[model samples]
Target: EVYDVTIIGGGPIGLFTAFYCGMRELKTKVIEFLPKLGGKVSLFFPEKIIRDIGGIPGIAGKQLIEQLKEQAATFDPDIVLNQRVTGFERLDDGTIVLTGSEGKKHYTRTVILACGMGTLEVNEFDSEDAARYAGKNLHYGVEKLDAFKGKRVVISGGGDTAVDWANELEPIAASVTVVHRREEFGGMESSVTKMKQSSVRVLTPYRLEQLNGDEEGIKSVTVCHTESGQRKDIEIDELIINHGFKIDLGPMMEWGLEIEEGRVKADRHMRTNLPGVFVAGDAAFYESKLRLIAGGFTEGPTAVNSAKAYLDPKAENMAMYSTHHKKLV
Candidate 1:
């Protein structure tokens, strides 16, 4: 079925777009390449504590995903997971077309490209036999932390996802081990300190070499001291890798839309050069500055306002943008 808007990427930004579209009484659809929704939030940190979310102070990254999922649900859009958008096209009459790997095409009057940095894959343990453990024992995402609760888990990486997981999982897991290849942590300094103060374990200059496991799961992982080259093995039920992600811009650029530095260009109305097309979230940033989750919260509405204008330019605002409904007392 054709949607009023099709949001590519079910992460925070894409999900927020759904809420905004729903509030405007516009039917929307959200598609994600990952197996589940919540986007990179789930893929990055499951057990880590997020302190900079604002107002919340400290909340688990995975927990934040649930909250966004619930809030985005109020708009009641169709959420399709495990669907990667491979191509994009524009109709002569002015519409956005999204084609998935399966060749399924979804149409919409507007679009919101929220695909985060892209899907993250592990690169540390490149050994063929050992690499199989990447997602098996070496988990990539955190949407399903309950499965690893109480088990000894080693988190390797230096970003917010790593530090966040180190903070959140210390309590639930039997033990938490953080190993970063380098000395510096790319995430918040406070989070790294918090990880150190808590039961979480931190190790720098530790590079993962390979993984060993049995029928049950991962048995051990071998790592060498980057400086000393001293190799050691650490036994654990699971290994969590946060090596980061890689992204492909896809065909959004070829649709005759305006883009600035790989992001959708937008005005105050959140309108792209292409009529009936707009953007929000990470992929939608066109302003002088970049936006994060909090920024996406504000962008969601601006994009819908543009959509409102697209649908009806004469009205001060599209009536359906609250014109289709009334506020309840």
Candidate 2:
């Protein structure tokens, strides 16, 4: 219902922000776009070892997420799942209203968007000469999880989105091949990790150059390499494109905050243009921004404190030491 600091995501950074907000003694809630928590980490690879975080030399993704979940639950913040936020507005009482795609709503005094990939839109295969096929045989997105049964599929993308679909379709399809332009994949290390184990044929630093098919649909795709201009043609029953996603922020974009390339332009405090709404994690853009989980750890508390100061001008700049967080100890 109503809370003081409601985070828009349940990803790792968002989870940490909930803990920090509680540490600051604010009523906190977290709304997750996905069912269950941990977002990409949970969805992608939970068994992988992450070594970049300070202090801990290494930890499994699943373990880290569990700790974040426990810390966030320290204050029993409401954790709402299975809803993608679609509407935003402020009422006369200065309370911010966030509506999910389902029309359910949340009331909060301050908003911190841990919403990742803010300004993201689905990438289209432009000028590939394959555009003429439209939705018949060539497709931008996919569906019916059943339609791909026993069919040969060529997924034209190398990013996580693309790599993910390839992994999923591998078992269902007779064959799955992923083609990407960049030499290295654009997805998370975990996403790239599964590629080696998966039977999905991966052609990197290569792009889909031509589509060969009849009016009925695409029958085969030709891929060309960057260095040698070498080309390889593979026959397929269906083609799914995931080349990359373009910038597109939906209803959230209309929040009226200044954003650039899907990331909110933020100040040192991680405050956005909007007074009561803020952003953190990769969704936040600063002049000196560095995109990393470690960076998000710092951004999370910065936004929480910034929200705290906004809610109570006389509040201390930061919370007391975790060492003395009696409830936690």
Candidate 3:
């Protein structure tokens, strides 16, 4: 089916853009790589409290995603799932044709490149036996913290996510042990300091040695010192691995778009260098780009407005007030 705007991502920004396009009375379709929506929010920290967004003091990652998902549904744009857009082509009439992993085609008048940090894939746990407990007691991402309440938790890795999870789980879990090969953590300095000051056991210069568990869940975890080879066993109920993520831009890299520092370079209007293409969220880069979800909230609509203008130069500068829009009224 032909769409007025095809958002190449189903993340927060992409979903919001789809809604804004609907506000402009434009047919929209959002293509997503993951089967489920919410992007990294769903994958990395569903339980983590996000406080950066303006207005609301705080909200869980999952809850915010739920709200965004619902808001996007107001437009009821075609929500394509489990499709990673890998290639694209232009027709004589200037319609953008996108090809997904399964060679499915999407015809659109304009494209919104909202693929946040590209397609994100978590770095897998290297241990062979680690595979068994992935969805059991071992987790690559912290979807829920309720399971670890009053239970010992061991987090592996020392990046921003590792440190953030340690600080977040410290008050909830029975005990939190952080195991990293390097003595110094790569997270924020203040966060690392806070973790050190807290009761969370900061075991640096150490690595996950082994997992001693049965078919049900993990019973204990062993950590070995990187240099001394000293191993220590800790009885833990949950093992959260924050080993970081692998980013792949896929075929977007070769689309002749202005790629600046691994992101789509965009103008103030969120228009990409490519004709009929726009960007928003983490995927859009500019000199004054604000790296916040709130920023994406504005960018989504801006890109939608730009698409609207591109589609019809005689259209209004922007969509009318939400309270007065015919669809809302």
Candidate 4:
């Protein structure tokens, strides 16, 4: 079946595009490379707090994704996960066929590329013991905050994720410590200030060298000074790695689309050079484009309308509000 729109990337922007496309009464499908949706937000930083999303004051990354996922369900698009679009081909009949990593194929009239920062891959843990305790005690991300409750936790990294997780777990965990390789943290000024004021122990210029644990879980961790090589052993029940991800466009790089510094260039209307194809969110770029979740929220509808116009050039530009639409109510 040829879908009206095939969205490549199940990030928040792509999800919103699917919602709007459904509102336009178009058959839609969202293909995500990762096993789950919400892209990088859900993948690496679900526990982080997001404050810039329009009306919402502050929401966790996971919560924001959950809401977006629920909203996208209103249109009931065919959501496919754990598939990476590796090839793109347009037929004479105007149907675009997308080939996935597993050799699965999808056909659609138009395409919306929302694959933010290209395909995403997490930075693997470097320690062997951490690898040994992978599922039980050592974690690359925090799926559930409750798991670490009442336990001693050590978060490794100096970025916003590390500081944010340290702050979030401080009240619940018996003890929280941040181990960074450098003396200065690479987080927001306010977050660093708040971290300094909080009770979470901050260990700077230290690198997590080893994790000591058994089949059950980790019992302690070894951290060493980056310069002096002084080592210290800290007893901890959990070890969370906040190291960032290594993102790339992957197969998208060979799609024959014009790319600048790893981002797809699109106009204000979220239109790419290719016909019946558009891009938005962090994956889409232009002059003075702002890379924020809130910004992508606007881009979603813009790309949807552009897709609508691409399908029907004479289509009206005005959008009907959901409050006035019967399906929404």
lDDT measured at residue 242 in model 2 versus the true structure, 0 to 100: 66
Q: For every candidate structure, what is the RMSD over all alpha carbons to the true structure, in angstroms?
A: 9.5, 12.8, 7.9, 8.7
Instruction: Work out the TM-score per prediction.
Output: 0.62, 0.64, 0.70, 0.69
Candidate 3: lDDT over CA atoms?
A: 0.85
Best by TM-score: 3
TM-score, cand. 4: 0.69
lDDT of 1 by residue, 65-103 (tens): 788888689857898876778777777877778888799
The local distance difference test score of each candidate is: 0.72, 0.80, 0.85, 0.84
- Candidate 3, residue 180: Cα displacement in angstroms equals 15
User: Candidate 2, residues 1-329: lDDT per residue as tens digits?
Assistant: 67999899888889999999999989998998656677555544465788998788998878888988998888889999877788888999899998988999899999998987742233545432333454455666676668999998888876677877887888888998888888677668787778756898888788778888887777888888988899999897988876554534577777687988778888999988888888888788877887867788899999999999999999999998899876667
Candidate 2 global TM-score = 0.64
What are the clashing pairs of model 1?
A: 47-168, 47-169, 48-164, 48-165, 48-168, 49-168, 319-323
| List of clashing residue pairs for candidate 3 | none
Better of 1 and 2 by lDDT: 2
Task: Please give the range of 10 consecutive residues that has the lowest summed lDDT in model 4.
Answer: 126-135
Worst 10 residues of 2 by lDDT: 119-128
Summing lDDT over every window of 10 consecutive residues in candidate 3, give the lowest-scoring window: 126-135
Error of 3 at 308 (Å): 0.8
Instruction: Summarize candidate 3's per-residue lDDT along 1-329 as a digit string, tens digits.
Output: 77999998887788888889888999989998776778767665666799989897999877888898988999888999878899889999999999997989889999998898788665644424433453467787677878778988999898988899999999999899998889888767999999999999999788777788988888887888889888998787888888876776867888998888888898999998889999999998888889888889899999999998998999999999998988898
Candidate 3: misplaced stretches above 4 Å? 124-236, 242-244
User: Which prediction has the highest lDDT against the true structure?
Assistant: 3
Among residues 3 or more apart in sequence or in different chains, the pairs in candidate 4 whose N, CA or C atoms overlap within 3 Å are: none
Per-residue lDDT of model 4, residues 1-329, tens digit only: 99999999998898888888888888999998766778767655576788888999999888988999998999789999878898898999889999997899899999999998877664645423432443466677677889888999999888888888888889889999998887788768898888878999989888777777777888887888888899999997888877776788888788888898789989889998888889989998888888988878888889989999989988867458989977887
